[PDB]
Symmetry: D2
């Protein structure tokens, strides 16, 4: 079995691929632009990926990998400004370049399924786009389109940490994402079946993508304070889910 | 730092403490009694704990441990029978003996807070007891009483696997529990703050406790198919949450 | 696969089984007796094992486990006293009681192979017993007898830490033990093939056993300052060696 | 703490940086050239590194990382040919290009200490170079020069697997390397203190480098069959050795 994993409580550019306005400052990963006085900047777009590609599956052996990632983000909006646009954890083709800005979160080009996009992402959408978005702020699973295949309402706690955990079990083909705001003791979870070997390539780069709104008052920050990831690829078709117990304690807690 | 962990995909009595009707057959952990023909038995009560005690905290250093557990259970009710009574993951005093049967799930004595009970458990209640239970089937966090301090409705999928994950972060004092029915793509999550050092002793035994109903037709099985656990105790007061990413992949997926 | 592991940098009686003069003081594991003034006591014998039994193999599936343990010991002899008798890491039958004292290190009864003894131990012998011992101080692998099947000279550094690592690879049936005295930059290693399923039972208790000499001037201390262990049991006959890289960093370094 | 780790039992180019004649075939990592008929090629040179750089230390916090790597190599020499030149595990500057071939193993330029070389490597030298090499085949620790600072004789078993483990403990500043030939039950170990923060940069690329002899009959193959690595970087100066127990079982065994 092939295993790849990492856990960062402190960020330093070397081990990451930064695109757009993504930068590393004070050890945290800042996905979008921020003026010196601390206020967010509109029309921003940043992405960051682990410098090592991860093999999601192997066409020769029919083995599919089971993986998990956990990270803490802090989304803050200036006093009188509205939230926009959101951040997303994504699996993209190794060479991939940023896509449309604004409501596309820098990972998709349209709200129409396009298998050739070869991108899967779990988004934390802070602005409802009338053309494909649910009524309020939400968490959603996007498979080759910005129109999520499943969503769940989310009560964003401005300025308070959000602890996220996303897992994929090759045995049940189930992708699950949960978010927790410790400060408020609120928690949200969402799950859906995703045939990964059909929506993505054998190798992908894992990371984040965030964008701020295209208007003067639709802004927010996107700071990743810590990030963990672990992947396991078997040798036969026989899938083996991961050990989350041992994972979180050895990585998140 | 002190660490203790284990992951069982196959059960064998030696490493576990069995009480009541709990038994190990065909490698799975069967908490309640079952007639030879496969049908569940009423008025049953079984418990099982890892043979090694786990230190939840240290009074001398002020360090509190962060831990996580994940397991898969299959709860089945004969064709025309009703569900009862439920199973619970619990932290109990090392020498502890089973308590009241029936709706008390074998871990509590009353629906009134009794700090001296020194027991905390996350229950998966399949029968609503008018005196302290919510309207329907639910997941709840019990702190020294059978009346949960917080609950969440749960749509039990008869005979289908339930993948559970419970975590405790010493930094936020937050206890979170989530349940997923892969077969139905449904998922539930629930969280609440719990001052562990006040509700439990320094050392505890971790395991399960399940009971069936006290009537002829209120029965169900309680098979644990796999179980993982991991605990980390720091050396100073400074708490450190676990790495769930690395945990699940190295343990659950 | 079944996994069991733990790592203690600080000791506390609850999770261990203590026999003889073994005690836990100031957080370290003291295997042999020591007078209040700090000097060792002759004719001492202490043993300590993890409170959870470990399954070395499964007769039904033909699976053999691969495991590894690492610990730091400090062996000190008063100014003008001679060294005796040694400490040993051992795998013994779950219910096992201490055996002969003195040169038998509390784990064996004779220097003649007795399969029914069902004990395997890696010893760090500090006193040469004319009847079965090599010329000087040594590390040896004992399989059901106090006469090691293989040994290696060892230059004990009085009062300086010794970092030990012992591993067993089910695939090569090879047992390897290495000792390092960081302070002196000296290192020793020793390896031998051992058909474990023939020399031990399915379940064993892992721990230490140490004894001091039976004479007024043959004494030394045996303090274990930290201890790690990890075991993995597959589901088919197909053995899988462990990941020492990930093991030491996640446990020893 | 920052952690990075991986374990490959099967190789696939994507996650690695290949230089020279290094190639991935049949899943194994072949460092040097080999004719289609299977015989090795002279004057060869290949290198391979994990695609993600690893931070060995942080100048700002004074924290030094503790790491460990384990891999299996198979060195074979055609019937009537002599061995040359060797393989080496090395830590090199992130952008680094191969160096001198032949007896320099592709990582060094001279047998004279040159701190600016910023390279540390543990070599498995199969050919004695009169100008800086010990009498026979050996394992050695090279710090910015091809003249090892310490060596140990090694009896190479032609065509038989060699299981290697190299560790670095930031607390003792000790680098230890051990080699085992399971087939022969032989084992070798070697250790030396190395002030890493003085010999290497903050970030390095970890991998292998191998070369064959510059003559018609001095050849041998260099196949890496599996490779594990794990690194842990603390947040304060306080170093913390790794858990090799948990590492090997979770990675090597
Ligand atoms: N990704 C996930 N988040 C929360 N609970 C889970 N249970 C299983 N996978 C999970
Ligand atoms: N116990 C838990 N279950 C699901 N998601 C979580 N996220 C953090 N802890 C969790
Ligand atoms: N137990 C052990 N000690 C030292 N080096 C090893 N290499 C493999 N197993 C080992
Ligand atoms: N790298 C290493 N190889 C073998 N035994 C060891 N003990 C500690 N570090 C070691
Ligand atoms: Ca949107
Ligand atoms: Ca009830
Ligand atoms: Ca002796
Ligand atoms: Ca040479
Ligand atoms: Mn959306
Ligand atoms: Mn209830
Ligand atoms: Mn001996
Ligand atoms: Mn050399």
């Amino acid at each position: 079995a092939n295993i790849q994993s990492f856990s960062f409580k402190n960020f330093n550019s070397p081990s990451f691929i930064l695109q757009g306005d993504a930068t590393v400052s004070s050890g945290k990963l800042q996905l979008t632009k921020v003026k010196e006085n601390g206020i967010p900047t509109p029309s921003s777009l940043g992405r960051a990926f682990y410098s090592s590609p991860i093999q999601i599956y192997d066409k020769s052996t029919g083995a599919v990998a089971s993986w998990a990632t956990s990270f803490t983000v802090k989304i803050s909006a200036p006093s009188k400004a509205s939230f926009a646009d959101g951040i997303a954890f994504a699996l993209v083709p190794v060479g991939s370049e940023p896509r449309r800005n604004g409501g596309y979160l820098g990972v998709f080009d349209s709200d129409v399924y396009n298998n050739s996009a070869q991108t899967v992402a779990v988004e934390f959408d802070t602005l409802s786009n009338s053309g494909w978005d649910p009524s309020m702020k939400h968490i959603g699973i996007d498979v080759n389109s910005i129109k999520s295949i499943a969503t769940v309402s989310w009560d964003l706690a401005n300025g308070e940490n959000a602890e996220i955990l996303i897992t994929y079990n090759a045995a049940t083909s189930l992708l699950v994402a949960s978010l927790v705001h410790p400060s408020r003791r609120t928690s949200y979870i969402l799950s859906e079946r995703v045939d990964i070997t059909n929506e993505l390539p054998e190798y992908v780069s894992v990371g984040f993508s965030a964008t701020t709104g295209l208007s003067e008052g639709y802004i927010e920050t996107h700071d990743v304070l810590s990030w963990s990831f672990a992947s396991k690829l078997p040798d036969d078709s026989t899938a083996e889910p991961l050990d989350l117990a041992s994972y979180l304690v050895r990585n998140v807690l």
